[PDB]
Amino acid sequence: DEAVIDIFPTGQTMSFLRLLHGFLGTCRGQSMHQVLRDPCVLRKQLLYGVCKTLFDTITVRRVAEEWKLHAALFPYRALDEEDLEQYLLVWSASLRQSVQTGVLGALRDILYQYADNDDYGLYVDWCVTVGLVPLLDVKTKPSEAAERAQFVRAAVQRATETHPLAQDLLQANLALLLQVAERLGAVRVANAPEVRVFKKVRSERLEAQLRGKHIRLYVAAEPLAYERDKLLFTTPVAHLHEEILRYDGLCRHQKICQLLNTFPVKVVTDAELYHLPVLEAVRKARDAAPFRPLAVEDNRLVANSFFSQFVPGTESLERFLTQLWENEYFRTFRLRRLVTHQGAEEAIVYSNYTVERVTLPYLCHILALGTLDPVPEAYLQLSFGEIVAAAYDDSKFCRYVELICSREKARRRQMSR
Amino acid sequence: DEAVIDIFPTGQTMSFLRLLHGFLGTCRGQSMHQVLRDPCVLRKQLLYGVCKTLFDTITVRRVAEEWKLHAALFPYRALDEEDLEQYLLVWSASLRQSVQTGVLGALRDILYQYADNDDYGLYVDWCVTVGLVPLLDVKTKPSEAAERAQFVRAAVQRATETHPLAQDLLQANLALLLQVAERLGAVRVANAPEVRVFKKVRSERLEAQLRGKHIRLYVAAEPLAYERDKLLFTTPVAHLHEEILRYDGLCRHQKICQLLNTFPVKVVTDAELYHLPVLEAVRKARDAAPFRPLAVEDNRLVANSFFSQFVPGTESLERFLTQLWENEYFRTFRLRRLVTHQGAEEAIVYSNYTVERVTLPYLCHILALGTLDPVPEAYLQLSFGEIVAAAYDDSKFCRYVELICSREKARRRQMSR
Amino acid sequence: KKVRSERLEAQLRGKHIRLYVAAEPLAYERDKLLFTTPVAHLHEEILRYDGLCRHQKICQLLNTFPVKVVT
């Protein structure tokens, strides 16, 4: 039996998850954590990365080849003065919308089936409250890899009946598609009881076990460790644990100093009230708070007493704590505050440092990052389905259309002129 | 008998539905849940999805063929200088309004008959308060599928007497229309007494039963489960349950400390008031609140008493709770606040993230999502009937009118010039 | 609302009449059942207001005299 210092299921960190999802502590700052765990933004960045890796592959060759196919199939032309640019622009729009809705249906189906592990919304807690994530690599029989291969083959059959160039792109990159699909169902966030993580004092190679079985873990911020056997975390929630404990103690104190002043006089020695009228309400109230005196024996000597009536004010440290939570979650992740003119907090949303700090290291330890890339934060406010329309616009897919536009305008301009 | 931790019909979550529809708690924020369960926006997005799936199908061929039909039926033409564009524009407007009112009558009939299951308004409660929906897959005899076929055939007979191009669109896609009509009446939201959901501790495969019958359920957020046998949820309403319980405790406390200070003096030892004139009113008032003393025996020793007069201030935590509720429902769903200049809260309405978070997973577990798409949030504020006029305008149905406009202007411009 | 089959239907003086349900209330082992309608969202608060109005009238009608004595 090795003496090993333990960190996870103590009071100091089991209380952290209760306060962080609000069993004990509450404030207006509690919302600024729940903005940080939108599990849709992970699937947005995931689809942005897989579509950006998808689209920039064969932008040069097939834009000539399928245009040659549709041109030799239908070379119909009346005049080369006005209608050529109109056919050009409706051509570009039709291609981009067809491959758009094709890969949009493909990514939408393969994500809406099995991207809802929703472990992001716990990953942010273990990256904000202890700085290191427990996770159990769930594996199954290898037949289920063939089952997922079957499912993504059915999805690209939907793409096959959608459009030929889209299914050409998916038949190009389905290998990495099924790779990131299996990496997506590869792990959980260790959301299970009787889990524990500890730091062995002889060799600081702190590792978790789940119910006796060793599990791996990704450490992002190892705590500082000294001759203080208990050890301080550098995590952002542990910056403010004392203050929110002070707040909840003040809430209990205010409740008990309210509940001990209910009666009008002091001596020494359930909607029942609403509906029922006042003539019996004054009857029920008088027995609802029984007058109780208070007494201790003393010989030849009684009190010269004093009375104190106060309630502790919550609004001062309430405004202080909400300001503390607000400026804290704006420093340690640079959330933006986009507003209109004289506009009051229209949106709080992820910015460039936030995705770099939480989403990209997440995909580092899911190891999907070998193919992916960050989404710019201006794109993240957009839609689930509109994001691709600017995503492959950011690639040279729509930039090659301008060059083939100039090539076609030269090709028929030397015909006309 | 298996020891299974139970979650649904306890105090902690049956009280959630009572506070959410306001049996116990109240605030100015309580409306911000009821804006989130507008059941008309689901049928809005549903009709947008089915009209978008309809209208992009045959935009290329039949616009030429039916114009050939109308041209060979009536090729009358006086001059090609001014009147050609006028006939062209009234032609395009008549086409779009005819198919508009055709599919509008079709979707209006098939929606107003059997889309008022209104289960969205309960789905948002089980997605906001426990993060998972119980639901019972209601099935019937297979004859009723032929009754629904009969109903949609009657609706397309109304389309038949409306317009032929709309009847061609519905005769093209009536199969998937029957699919979405069946999937719409496929399930309820498990709004029934004696329903229960629990989490089996031996394998965390939490499942619901209805009165002993096993039913499936869609989990969107697995709650955190530990050696704490009770488990904490990550949902929005459980983030603020304690604070509104504090509010209701203060409401009861203020009601008592108002109801116990009603008499003017204290010693130690129903509209019947309004109509009645004051001479008998002051008579009924004194017996309406009888003077009562209060007494406990003591020997050789009496009181040195003190008096307290206060009621708790409700407006401080009332403003605090409404602000908490407000910024809570603004972070966890990015509800927009569209306003005019110096305009105060003109509308709170669904934005891009909100439909992605609640409507699209709803249609994911109704499995209508294989044919549908999100409506952009700017369209959802528009009408039930005007929405399609922009919806197929977003498609190439009105964009192909510009190309056949240029084709007709070339076809008669080479005739005139 | 019939508890055996939730097929809630109205009658007029013993004669059955039809009804259009726009929002069926939620029903549980709570025999009284909660409505999802907007007026039931604020019923408790306006009952609190009317109780306060009665309370203010009766605490006005009990302070009308200038002096108060005991005996």
Between CA B206 and CA B294 the distance in angstroms is: 57
Alpha carbons A269 and A266: distance in angstroms, whole number: 10
Contact A335, A32 (CB under 8 A): yes
Cα angle value B297/B302/B308 (rounded, 5°)? 105
How is residue A202 annotated by DSSP? S
Rg over alpha carbons for chain C, rounded to the nearest Å, is: 22
B82: number of CA atoms within 13 Å, CB side? Answer: 0
The residue with tokens 């792109």 is A169
- Contact yes or no for B344/B319 (Cβ under 8 A): no
Given phi > 0 = left and psi -120 to 50 = alpha, else beta, which region is B232? Answer: beta
Cα(C51)–Cα(A329) distance, integer angstroms: 44
Is B205 exposed, middle or buried, given 0-12, 13-18 or 19+ CB atoms closer than 10 A?
Answer: exposed
Contact of B217 with B134, CB cutoff 8 Å: yes
Which amino acid type is present at position B218?
Answer: Y
3-state secondary structure of B313: coil
A274 contacts in chain C (CB < 8 Å)? 44, 47-48, 51
The Cα–Cα gap between B42 and B310 comes to 49
Minimal C-alpha gap between C48 and chain B (Å): 9
Q: List b or e across B327-356, with b for residues whose CB sees 16 or more CB atoms inside 10 angstroms.
A: bbbbbbbbbbbeeeeeeeeeebbbbbbbbb
CA B75 from centre of chain: 51
Give chain C's largest Cα–Cα span. Answer: 66
Amino acid occupying residue C61? L
Which residues on neighbouring strands pair with residue A64, listed in sequence order? Answer: none
Beta strands at A336-338 and A347-349: parallel, antiparallel or unpaired: antiparallel
Q: Which residues pair with A213 in a beta bridge?
A: A210
**In this structure, what DSSP letter does residue A187 have?**
B
Q: Tell me how far apart the alpha carbons of residues C36 and B281 are, in angstroms, rounded to a whole number.
A: 41
Tell me the one-letter amino acid at B63.
V
Contact residues, chain A, for C58 at CB < 8 Å: 278
Tokens of A132: 């290191």
> What separation in angstroms does the CA of A261 have from each of A86, A316, B262, B307, B310?
81, 22, 16, 10, 9
SS3 A5: strand
Nearest chain A alpha carbon to C55? A278
Sign of CA dihedral A114, A116, A120, A123: negative
* Structure tokens that stand for B77 in this block: 């033409």
Q: Compute the nearest-CA separation of A116 from chain B (Å).
A: 8
Give the integer Cα–Cα distance in Å for B244 and C53.
25
Q: Which residue matches tokens 């299951």? A: B117
- The number of residues making up chain B comes to 417
Chain B nearest C-alpha distance from A355 (Å): 17
Closest CA to A167 of A226, A214, A120, A103: A103
| CA–CA separation, B172 and B166 (whole Å) | 10
Q: What is the DSSP string of B252-312?
A: HHHHHHHHTS-SS-------HHHHS-HHHHHHHHHHHS---------SS-----EE-----
DSSP string for B20-77: HTTSS---SSTHHHHTTT-THHHHHHHHHHHHHHHHTSSTTTHHHHHHHHHHHH----
Q: Which of A83, A274, A277 sits opposite B410 (nearest CB)?
A: A83
Q: B377 to chain A, minimum CA–CA distance in Å? A: 9
Q: How far is it, in rounded angstroms, from Cα A248 to Cα C10?
A: 51
User: How far is C29 from B18, CA to CA, in rounded Å?
Assistant: 13
What the block records as the tokens of A363 is 């995909």
Q: Closest by alpha carbon to B215, among B240, B194, B234, B236?
A: B194
Contacts of A274-281 with C-beta under 8 Å, sequence gap 24+, read A274/B255, A274/C44, A274/C47, A274/C48, A274/C51, A275/C47, A277/B270, A277/C54, A278/B270, A278/B288, A278/B289, A278/C51, A278/C54, A278/C55, A278/C58, A279/B270, A279/B288, A281/B259, A281/C51
CA B357 to CA A39: how far, in whole Å? Answer: 9
Name the region of A172 (left: φ>0; alpha: ψ -120 to 50; beta: rest).
alpha
Is the CB of A60 inside 8 Å of chain C's CB atoms? no
Shortest CA gap B188–chain A (Å): 21
What is the rounded CA–CA span in Å between residue B120 and residue B122? 5
Name every residue whose Cβ is closer than 8 Å to that of residue A328 and which is 6 or more positions away in sequence.
A29, A236, A239, A240
Compute the CA torsion angle B370, B376, B380, B386 (nearest 10 deg).
Answer: -90
Do the beta carbons of residue A221 and residue B216 sit within 8 Å?
no
The β-bridge partners of A198 are A6, A207
Chain C CA closest to residue A282: C55
Judged by CB atoms closer than 8 Å, whether chains meet at B23 and C42 is answered as no
As a whole number of angstroms, the distance between CA A106 and CA A67 comes to: 24
Scan for tokens 């009754």, then name that residue.
B147
Give the nearest partner residue to B310 out of A17, A40, A261, using CB atoms.
A261
Question: SS3 for A233?
Answer: coil
Nearest CA in chain A to C53: A278
Residues in chain A within 8 Å Cβ distance of B302: 269
Residue B396: burial class (beta carbons within 10 Å; 0-12, 13-18, 19+): buried
Structure tokens at A220: 């992002």
In angstroms, the CA B350 to CA B359 distance is 10
* Whole-number Å distance between alpha carbons of A400 and A335: 35
Instruction: Say what the resolution is, in angstroms.
Output: 4.2
In degrees rounded to 5, what are phi and psi of residue B92? -65, -40
**Helical H segments across A115-260, by residue range:** 120-129, 143-162, 164-184, 241-259
Interchain CB distance below 8 Å, A28 and B323? yes
**Residue B304 C-alpha from the chain's centroid:** 61
Give the pair of three-digit tokens for residue C20. Answer: 């259009």
Query: Rounded to whole angstroms, what are the CA distances from B136 to A102, A234, A369, B194?
Result: 33, 48, 40, 13
Determine the length of chain A.
417
Q: Is A317 on the interface with B (CB under 8 A)?
A: no
A270 CB neighbours in chain B (<8 A) are: 252
What are φ and ψ of residue C56, in 5° steps? -70, -35
Q: What CA–CA distance (Å, rounded) separates A121 from A117?
A: 10
Mutation pick from B10, B19, B26 vs chain C, by most beta carbons of C within 10 Å, is: B26
Residues 231-290 of B with CB under 8 A from C: 251, 255, 258-259, 262-265, 267, 270, 273-274, 281-282, 285-286, 288-289
Specify the amino acid at residue A283.
R
| Backbone dihedral region for residue A345 (phi beyond 0: left; psi -120 to 50: alpha; all else: beta) | left
